Amino acid sequence: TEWTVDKIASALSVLAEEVPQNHSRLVNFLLEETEKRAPQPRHLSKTDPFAHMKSKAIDANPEGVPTMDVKFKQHSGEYGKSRNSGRRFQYPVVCIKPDREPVPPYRFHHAEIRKNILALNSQLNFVPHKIQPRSQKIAKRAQAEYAATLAPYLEPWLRKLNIEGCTKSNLIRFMASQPESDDSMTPQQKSNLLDTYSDDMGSPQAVRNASMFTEAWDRVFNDQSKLRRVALRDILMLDKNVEPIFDNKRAKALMQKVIDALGSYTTLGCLICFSHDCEHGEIERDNQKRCFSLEEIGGLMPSLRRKWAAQIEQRQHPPCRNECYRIHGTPPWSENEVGTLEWMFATIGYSQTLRPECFVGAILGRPCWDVHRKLQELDLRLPPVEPRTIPKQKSLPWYDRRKKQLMSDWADATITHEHAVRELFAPCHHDGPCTAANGCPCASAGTHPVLCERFCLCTAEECPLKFTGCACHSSGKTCLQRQREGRPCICVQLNRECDPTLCKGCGARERADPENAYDEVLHSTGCQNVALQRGAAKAVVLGKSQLEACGYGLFAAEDIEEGEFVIEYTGELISHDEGVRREHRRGDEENKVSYLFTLLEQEGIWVDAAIYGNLSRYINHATDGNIMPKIMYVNHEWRIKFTAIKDIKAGEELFFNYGDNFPNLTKKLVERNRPLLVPKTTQPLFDPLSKVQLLPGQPLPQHPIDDSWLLLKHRDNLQDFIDLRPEEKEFLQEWDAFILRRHISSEQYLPRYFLRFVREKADWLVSKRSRGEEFSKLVATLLARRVLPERVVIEATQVLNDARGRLRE
Amino acid sequence: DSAEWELPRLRTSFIFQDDYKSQDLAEFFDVKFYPYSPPGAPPVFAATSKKHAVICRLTQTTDKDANPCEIIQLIRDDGNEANCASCWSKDPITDQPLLCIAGNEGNVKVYNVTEGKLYRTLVGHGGGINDLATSPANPYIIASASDDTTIRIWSLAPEHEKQPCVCILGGEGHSYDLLSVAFHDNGRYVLSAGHDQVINLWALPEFPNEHMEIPIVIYYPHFSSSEIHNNLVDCVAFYGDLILSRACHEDTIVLWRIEGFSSDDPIPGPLDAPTPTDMTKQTRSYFTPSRPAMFTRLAQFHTPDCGVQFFMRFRMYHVPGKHPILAFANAKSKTFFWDLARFGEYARFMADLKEAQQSYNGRVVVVDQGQGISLAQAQQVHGPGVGVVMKPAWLVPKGFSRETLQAWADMYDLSNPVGLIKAHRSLAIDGAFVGRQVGWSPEGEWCVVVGNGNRALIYQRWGKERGLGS
């Protein structure tokens, strides 16, 4: 009845005896089950295939044939005593030669990716022969395994001991109150425990009992003379309501209602590719991800306020088939149903050609006059937005954004075009002009100003630094490197590809669309500065390099005229330190094999093609190469393009001068104390996947890219957020699986892809109400950034209204 | 009667001429018995050295001085490859035996052994091959583990002649040289392991009965852990649904299981695998049913004096109607056996004896089994006053002494997953010997151990020798 540390310790020792007993029972049970399940031998031949073959031992009574010796001893008895010294015999040898040579060497399965993918930082757990001492490795593993053995016993033993206050939850409360939980726990963690557990532990005896139980357990099971040992604290940390509090996998008047309603989408939604788990963003050392999202540029309100101000600063169509309030007008509403019209109302704003009523009534299964009735009885009031007055600003002498032209000192005045020295910053989200005084990073973060890009909240009307695209047009080819036209292509001058939206004269809009990638007529005029977005590579083929003791090389499979884009260098984007860990994890000397291409030196991003990438990873080095790499800015992605510097005939091997493109990070660290055919060539050529040898004049193998493994990782990355309800994950995952497959880089293509999604998933979206509600939060977010045209919201209203009418079945 | 319990003993040994000359650094790296002969046939094994495949047939003999091992085919790899891995298959048309041999150039040679010719070559690995295994469910399906960090699955079926690589286990599950590959008996789960200390379990799809222009690539294993051992792993295998694996510097073979894994469940598909979303997790599992635990260590067979050696392989004999025998040879001239059925029989004997010790307050008489005496005749020699417990004959002393019980517990107690089970038979080898591989004949009467110095040790049980013949 009245316990002591000794009495409970004594009792735990007796209960602990059932652990080895159960273990023996379990292993014996599993051994018996396995013996019973022994497999019958299969595919037996009906005759002994060796029956006709006799001993090949040579007789004393084989000329020219190679011969080997074998010496036999026979043994008997218990200790293997040999009967005598043995006897040797001569045997003829059948010599068989192989008919095929191995393919050139490689490490890992080399898989194709369409675009660069973003890697997590790995740990250095193995180095062929930063790191944790192996002794701590070994010891924690022993303790982990023992803790897992002991964990299932604690509640059964507690129930049998039945001591007042010795409760799994009271023991967690006691643990949280002990000093060890300051050097094991941080604020908000104690706050999360206090949510589930609180601090009251009951009677004085309940508190004394739990303390004695804890001491008595750490005395019996945490005797520090042992390697296998568990503190009770280590077992309670395994508890399903405690573990999540120590898992950092977390995504995150009227307006702060809406702000919180769209938090998942403002936080995760990519500004570039519109997906919620994707290849953009930055990875921190602990692998927490800073998404390239609205939160990077100040969240919902700075963009929404600007949309409202744009709406009232423009001073001066068919009604929905859901009993439209426009014809009519005026069941209890959930708070969810009300919130849904709250955020559509606020993000549609001061519009003329779009009203929430019809669309909210398409997302909720409600008639349009119903949500108009609820709209009017709730009388929602927007914040009033102040007339934004734009202060007159002097243009820059090196850049005229109206003529879209660089002039005079420009290469010395900006580092906009010098990607190797640029440091990356979140686009403008300030009020007022882009000056050092207002803290604008574009103007002042670097050694020089850079132009403001499409994601900065400034407008070309306001900001003298704002990029507005190139002025090029021509019935012939334009946006070329040294155009014979009167003035050059600002886009090309800045080492960027043309923007499908800002470059209105050159045909970028159509040529930067991958759905026109193989319209040779289209791409034979107009802008020739969209090749990475076009996504089309010259025909190439893998083979044995012509250089001796080089392994693979890459060969042209079609004639390539000088100046033509050839291929992109794709790979994993990694950090400097992840580059270094990788140089270690694979071995070392200058017999090494690097696929580590420098993308942004100063920012510290490398492209690693050692596992994932494309055929370009096989191009070998020459001083007098026939192609040239170049870093390009492509819609706020930086990418590696290869361009021909000579005419290259089909069958010729590609080379470029590696320069310092493939650095030795660790060595620099220690110092800082017309069908397409296989071409006729001399070298053997291989299918990149099967490594089957290719024969000249056969169809060039062109295998569609396998992305399913990549959609699964991105789905699982959203599943892992403890921050998101299942209704959120369901929809976010559906949208991401669709939009990731379209590899969007420009908002020019989003409305078409969006309309395609609401068409394909229309039946799915109206089958379950949380899906429609989540779909409407995405819409509200894209509308707030003025990135989804009001035209498409009206069409989705029809599409879903018609899908739900087809469901009434 | 006691025959069920007999373990092997050394019956014959041979040394093969050195073929990597130095004139003693050649080794047999592999030995495999042909598994597709009719029941009863003379067992035939191949012992692959670095340059030769020595094919022998074993025939039991009534003469102690006679030699049961006769060499029926001897093949040399006339190319530049040094080999260390082999596995058996069959011609899909003729049903002739095919011996596969792989090594350090990165190619599988397939030999038609009865006719002494090359059947074909399997080309495509990017580095040396260190293990091969045949699927127990399809004798035309072979898996190969390579320095190039991949597994490749090959088919010798006619429909795949023009491109025989049907599957590549790739992705990021492994990061350095693979040393071991094994098939589950269902032919659909594959285990792999090597220098990166990861053990991976992979689920194979069904492969089309027709030509595949490219292999199916698999990017995620379904179970993955680098935490069952703390060193490089060089041998892995299924024992039914349990796992047996071995690592360097540990002197143990570990028996363990994946929580939630059962070959009775449907085979999961490739999009069901777990992906490495958390980089600090060194174990992940599709199969997982307080925090679980995704594996459970069960027992450790003690395998002393392997030192720093690696690429040393055990082999379990597992056949319906016979006892399961685990055999492994170390690096200091010893060969170890465990009969897994002794575990259950010891535990029954200790439960029967602990029971009679209370029910009769100690007046308990212990009688050996395997006698003409049964728990009945032994009870009639006394009556209701004293308990009779039957003790297995192979349980030998040193009431019973402390040292006798401790010596029995050391060999048969399964109560501690972190314990060390001493071998049930430990046989010494003349001279300095390092085991590389063990193989068992279909009926389990022969056990062959091969290793350095091009030596084969041939153990037998259930022999028919009768009375010398010199």
Ligand SMILES: C[S@@+](CC[C@H](N)C(=O)[O-])C[C@H]1O[C@@H](n2cnc3c(N)ncnc32)[C@H](O)[C@@H]1O
């Ligand atoms: C991007 S990889 C090129 C593909 C490589 N040949 C292969 O088999 O995978 C670059 C590596 O190839 C080798 N390499 C490329 N060009 C070379 C050259 N001109 N001379 C010697 N080695 C070269 C070096 O090992 C270098 O690390």
Ligand SMILES: [Zn+2]
């Ligand atoms: Zn993105």
Ligand SMILES: [Zn+2]
């Ligand atoms: Zn309407």
Ligand SMILES: [Zn+2]
């Ligand atoms: Zn600014």
Ligand SMILES: [Zn+2]
């Ligand atoms: Zn800016």
Ligand SMILES: [Zn+2]
């Ligand atoms: Zn600006």
Ligand SMILES: [Zn+2]
């Ligand atoms: Zn232009």
Ligand SMILES: [Zn+2]
């Ligand atoms: Zn342009």
Ligand SMILES: [Zn+2]
């Ligand atoms: Zn252009």
